């Protein structure tokens with residue numbers, strides 16, 4: 087029941103962000119929420135080409151690092167690669183089919199496009215610091231500890247996509263599919279979308295920032311400067327991506343968009359809280375693998391754990407959630423040099 | 427049965443373009459078909475911003491145009507706007523779920539993204555030539571002649587998407603849903619993808635090019651020059667987009683990628699031909715109506731009809747189809763001035 091060009095002349099300023107009539111005409115002369123048009127303009131103003139970045143000195147620097155530091159650096163980089171591989175396709179496959187205002191539709195496509203640039207930047211780094219990129223990329227798929235840390239991201243998206251297909255194909259109601267009773271509830275699908283957004287918020291707001299701190303620890307040592315320039319550019323894009331999901335979520339919570347979404351945000355509040363607590367614990371658990379062969383001055387499991395707590399509280403407060411962790415000052419204030 | 431991250435380590439150089447294992451790692455250090463990596467690189471190198479183009483004199487040119495010429499210009503722009511609105515979302519929603527090699531997956535996202543820039547540029551033009559853009563944007567959805575010229579485009583994508591959902595949800599076989607039999611066949615879904623791609627090839631390679639003739643006819647008269655600069659950049663992008671679908675279609679019909687797709691292509695050779703001819707016919711009908719209130723300087727319904735027949739022959743030959751029209755040389759060689767590429 088999805089269509090690539092809905093034939094009803096509708097007032098796009100009055101549709102909800104999600105689940106209304108699919109967008110027909112892509113126009114940018116007006117917006118229900120100008121924040122998405124501002125985000126598109128800012129992301130386009132940030133356009134960068136990874137291949138232009140000089141990473142010729144990173145190979146010298148990398149091969150010079152002691153073995154445990156190569157492990158820390160590459161294990162981090164493989165996780166960034168996994169996340170952006172998922173973020174390049176998922177907003178388009180999972181969110182695009184449910185969007186009903188043009189400014190949010192184009193924002194999601196722009197945001198997903200910018201993630202493919204990040205992926206292309208990891209290939210640029212990887213091909214220039216190791217002799218066989220294939221060993222690095224293949225490990226991303228099979229590495230148990232990497233998958234463990236990301237557990238639940240692809241699951242969430244996949245479940246939303248499957249429920250969306252049932253909805254678009256069958257409509258609301260209880261159906262009989264190959265003899266099994268299948269319930270399609272729009273309210274349940276709105277909850278699934280809503281929690282998928284909260285999960286994406288945690289992914290960009292927390293998981294990527296923990297990874298940035300690990301990358302910048304090398305830059306503070308005056309090493310892997312090509313990587314650092316790229317991570318700085320990637321972080322600048324991620325700041326916009328998380329601004330986008332924070333606004334989607336806070337707008338839904340306000341009751342100014344779909345009223346049912348404001349009810350759902352309030353009703354599913356413990357689940358929001360729980361998914362942030364679980365993601366933080368996963369980022370902490372990654373330290374055992376990250377520092378398996380030794381830690382570095384200023385970067386070890388304890389510092390990583392303190393920073394996870396610090397940044398999780400900040401991101402949760404930004405979308406209205408209670409704080410799970412003891413408050414603390416930033417354990418790694420040197421990161422502010424790199425996050426500009 | 428689709429996943430955003432397939433957990434099976436697979437050799438991405440050996441998957442088919444479509445229907446294989448969904449792409450897990452996005453890497454660009456190797457590819458099965460390097461044409462898609464070359465297209466991504468070229469499209470990224472062509473990045474442009476509509477707001478960077480001065481359209482300040484287009485308002486006065488448009489206003490001084492005779493009424494039938496305003497009608498020609500605006501009707502043509504509304505159709506370009508409809509086509510890129512569809513092209514901004516559709517390659518992503520329709521093709522991404524079926525791609526199994528990374529370079530093609532990123533090419534599609536890059537191609538679709540470049541179309542949103544086109545849509546943004548039409549807003550930049552429209553806002554700068556009319557008092558109230560809403561009059562122009564609302565007429566796109568229900569404009570009778572526009573619907574007639576673009577008739578069928580959304581239905582091909584829509585049917586492909588629907589059949590893809592059934593396939594991912596239920597898999598191949600004879601199923602039942604609420605008392606009715608629903609048959610899912612991978613062969614039929616491959617055929618729907620093949621025809622959808624042939625239609626996208628006609629959209630970008632013939633429908634858009636006919637619209638470019640209209641826009642550049644004004645540029646030749648030194649009018650609507652802001653619009654001209656923007657259509658020039660859009661046409662440079664479209665040359666890449668059609669290069670991408672020509673390669674997808676030729677790799678599918680040659681049999682080098684999926685033997686079954688080669689058998690399918692041969693099997694719908696006649697259908698594909700008649701659809702191409704139908705697209706050409708819709709474009710002629712649009713011209714006939716558009717030049718009803720009066721011809722323009724340097725363009726009329728017959729000249730445009732010849733251009734449609736000329737470009738249709740070239741594009742059909744490029745994807746191995748027989749030529750439907752009498753061969754002729756380009757009836758409007760001046761257009762080459764504007765079609766870099």
Ligand SMILES: [Hg+2]
Pocket residue numbers: 239242243281282283285286
């Ligand atoms: Hg999600």
Ligand SMILES: [Hg+2]
Pocket residue numbers: 296297298299300301390
């Ligand atoms: Hg870290």
Ligand SMILES: [Hg+2]
Pocket residue numbers: 351352354355358359
């Ligand atoms: Hg919440």
Ligand SMILES: [Hg+2]
Pocket residue numbers: 388391392395
């Ligand atoms: Hg801690």
Ligand SMILES: [Hg+2]
Pocket residue numbers: 520583622623626
């Ligand atoms: Hg298609």
Ligand SMILES: [Hg+2]
Pocket residue numbers: 579582583621622623625626
């Ligand atoms: Hg199509």
Ligand SMILES: [Hg+2]
Pocket residue numbers: 502636637639640641730
């Ligand atoms: Hg025309």
Ligand SMILES: [Hg+2]
Pocket residue numbers: 498499502639640641643644722725
């Ligand atoms: Hg014209």
Ligand SMILES: [Hg+2]
Pocket residue numbers: 636637638639640730
């Ligand atoms: Hg024309």
Ligand SMILES: [Hg+2]
Pocket residue numbers: 620621624690691693694695697698
């Ligand atoms: Hg065909």
Ligand SMILES: [Hg+2]
Pocket residue numbers: 617689690691692693694
């Ligand atoms: Hg066929």
Ligand SMILES: [Hg+2]
Pocket residue numbers: 679691692694695698
């Ligand atoms: Hg064919």
Ligand SMILES: [Hg+2]
Pocket residue numbers: 621624625697698699701702
């Ligand atoms: Hg065709």
Ligand SMILES: [Hg+2]
Pocket residue numbers: 710730731732734735
């Ligand atoms: Hg014709």
Ligand SMILES: [Mn+2]
Pocket residue numbers: 170173200201204320324
């Ligand atoms: Mn990213």
Ligand SMILES: [Mn+2]
Pocket residue numbers: 173201290323324327
């Ligand atoms: Mn991001």
